[PDB]
Amino acid sequence: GSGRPMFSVFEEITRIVVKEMDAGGDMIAVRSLVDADRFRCFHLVGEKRTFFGCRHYTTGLTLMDILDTDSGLQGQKAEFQILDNVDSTGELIVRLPKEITISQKIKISENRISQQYLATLENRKLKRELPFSFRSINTRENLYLVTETLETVKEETLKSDRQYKFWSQIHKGQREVTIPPNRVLSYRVKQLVFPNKETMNIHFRGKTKSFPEGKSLGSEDSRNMKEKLEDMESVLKDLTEEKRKDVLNSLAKCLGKEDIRQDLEQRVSEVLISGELHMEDPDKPLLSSLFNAAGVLVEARAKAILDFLDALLELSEEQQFVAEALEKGTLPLLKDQVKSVMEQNWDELASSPPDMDYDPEARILCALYVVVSILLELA
Amino acid sequence: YLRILTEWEKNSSPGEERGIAFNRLSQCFQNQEAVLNLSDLNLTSLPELPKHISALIVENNKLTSLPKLPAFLKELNADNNRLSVIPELPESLTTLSVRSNQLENLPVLPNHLTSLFVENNRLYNLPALPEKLKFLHVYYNRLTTLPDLPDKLEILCAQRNNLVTFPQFSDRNNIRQKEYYFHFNQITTLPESFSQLDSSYRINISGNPLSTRVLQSLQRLTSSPDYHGPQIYFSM
């Protein structure tokens, strides 16, 4: 359920692809090259809730890993349904802006799952042996099926000379990425719903929950980023200075350390889903701070820490600065600088509506702001 | 015929792989091969073409004009060339791909043409669209209007043009799934007929100077619990 570090130049390219082909539509840009192989048609994608809204993450699963098996659908082995029911639906040209160089246009190829096949995904029964990646999904997250992809047709190398304003207002010229052939750049999804533990339907239009059994129609979160960050700060002020020290140290050990961050995220998610703390956690202090004086888990603390840990992923080149400012006690100056850049180049970006499409620079500034604010309040 | 190709070979420009081209042309004529592919040869000209060919693929070259097309061509792929004009199209043509070239106009389009890809050009006008047309790419051009759309048209990519008026549709005479892209244009109004289109339409008119009245009517129409119209996207 974890995400992937920030790959800024690649996200720039894929977002340009999405703007020129489905501006304002439902096509989604692949953020990380690392995921451009597990976002193909028939692949299953998870949707988790973060500070900025929703994050799509790879599962490695496909529809065939969970589904029991004049349209041309009878026969076909039922094991290679992936290649047979994915049709090439044309080729397209994306004109690149001035900041992007190619080793002025990139060619891409579109693949789609046939509407016929997608029409058979009603009242389908899941397999009797479901992979652990599927049955251990947090029953509050969503699950999607990749329906359409746009991919490169050959190996490309691209450069961005675009400069981020916060680089000079807080020594690298161009950012380069080499994309292998047939790598997905943008995709479209359709939601998978599971009315019970043995059934699966496809959902085409409208927001919904993939696991609706026992749940009711409920108005979802609509807070902006400022409200969310302030509620986080209040959550940490309801903490014993000892619990505050525990959390601050556990978080400080994560800067520049991807494995510590991933393990802490997974463990906080574990204790959020279970509500229990066992006697086999070295990071038991942090996991202890998630419980109130009555030994009951405060989900707000777990969600705040998970949002901090997820925001750390958008800071691929900035965690060293934050750690230095935490050690030298200069986080106030850093927070002021970040707020200044946000107020100079963007408008009310700190009050952005939930699940806003963020340009990479904007998302990096917001993640930096959240991380610095949390570390400052905890100290 | 062999002497014509041999004399055409005598140019031998820098980067022109004209020997490979002579081999492929002679093989195509002598064996009566349905497909002739001269792609990625940096060629600047083409001789008389084997008049039996079904598909001519001359993508990624330096062509500025094209010879007379064989009378039974089904597919013509001339992407990424410098073609400022393309010759008369045979009625047997069903796929025309000449994207990424230097075209400002197109000839009369055979009525049984199924695929037309002319994106990345400088087109100012489009001819009457063939009735059997199913897939059309005209994005990255300078079109100000579009001909009335045929009935069997499934994919229309007309974004990034200079469109001023919304095109005339086929009165929902088609009932399959269709995606029409009009984003990044100059359309300021929409016809009332829009409110009678089915859910089978996916229309993208984002990045358009839509008037306040059109935007408010779109918001009132899509916000109604009783909206079963097109999947519409409108965002500036």
Curated annotation (Swiss-Prot), chain A:
Residues 219-247 form a coiled coil. Changing residue 310 to A: Does not relieve autoinhibition. GO terms for cellular component: cytoplasm; plasma membrane. In the gastrointestinal tract, expressed in proliferating cells, including in the basal cell layer of esophagus and in isthmus/neck of stomach. Changing residue 31 to A: Reduced ability to trigger pyroptosis. Induction: Expression is induced by interferon-gamma (IFNG). Overexpressed in inflammatory bowel disease (IBD). There is a cross-link at residues 165, 172 ((Microbial infection) Glycyl lysine isopeptide (Lys-Gly) (interchain with G-Cter in ubiquitin)). Changing residue 48 to A/E: Decreased ability to trigger pyroptosis. The record marks 87-88, 200-201, 209-210, 215-216 as: Cleavage. Changing residue 192 to P: Abolished ability to mediate pyroptosis. InterPro entries: Gasdermin (IPR007677), Gasdermin_pore (IPR040460), Gasdermin_PUB (IPR041263). Keywords: Cell membrane, Coiled coil, Cytolysis, Cytoplasm, Isopeptide bond, Lipoprotein, Membrane, Necrosis, Palmitate, Transmembrane, Transmembrane beta strand, Ubl conjugation. Belongs to the gasdermin family. Long terminal repeat (LTR) of endogenous retrovirus HERV-H with reverse orientation may serve as alternative promoters of GSDMB gene. GSDMB may be used as predictive markers of cervical lymph node metastasis and may help, with a panel of other genes, to discriminate between primary tumors of oral squamous cell carcinoma that metastasize to cervical lymph node and those that do not metastasize. Intramolecular interactions between N- and C-terminal domains are important for autoinhibition in the absence of activation signal. The intrinsic pyroptosis-inducing activity is carried by the N-terminal domain. This is Gasdermin-B. It comes from Homo sapiens. The gene is GSDMB.
Swiss-Prot record, chain B:
Keywords: Host cytoplasm, Leucine-rich repeat, Plasmid, Repeat, Secreted, Transferase, Ubl conjugation, Ubl conjugation pathway, Virulence. It comes from the Bacteria. Changing residue 160 to E: Abolished ability to ubiquitinate GSDMB. Changing residue 155 to G: Abolished ability to ubiquitinate GSDMB. It is found in: Secreted; Host cytoplasm. The keyword Repeat applies. Residues 1-236 are annotated as: Interaction with target proteins. LRR repeats lie at residues 32-53, 54-71, 72-93, 94-111, 112-131, 132-153, 154-173, 176-197, 199-222. One of its GO terms (cellular component) is extracellular region. GO terms for molecular function: ubiquitin protein ligase activity. One of its GO terms (biological process) is effector-mediated activation of host programmed cell death by symbiont. The keyword Coiled coil does not apply. Changing residue 117 to S: Abolished ability to ubiquitinate GSDMB. Ubiquitinated in the presence of host E1 ubiquitin-activating enzyme, E2 ubiquitin-conjugating enzyme and ubiquitin. Changing residue 183 to G: Abolished ability to ubiquitinate GSDMB. The LRR (leucine-rich repeat) domain forms a slightly curved solenoid and may mediate interaction with target proteins. E3 ubiquitin ligase effector protein that interferes with host's innate immunity. Functions to alter host cell physiology and promote bacterial survival in host tissues. Catalyzes ubiquitination of human gasdermins GSDMB and GSDMD, promoting their degradation by the proteasome, thereby preventing cell death. In contrast, activates host cell pyroptosis in mouse cells: catalyzes ubiquitination of mouse Nlrp1b allele 1 protein, releasing the cleaved C-terminal part of Nlrp1b, which polymerizes and forms the Nlrp1b inflammasome followed by host cell pyroptosis. Belongs to the LRR-containing bacterial E3 ligase family. This is E3 ubiquitin-protein ligase ipaH7.8. It comes from Shigella flexneri. The chain holds residues 27 to 262 of 565 of the full protein.
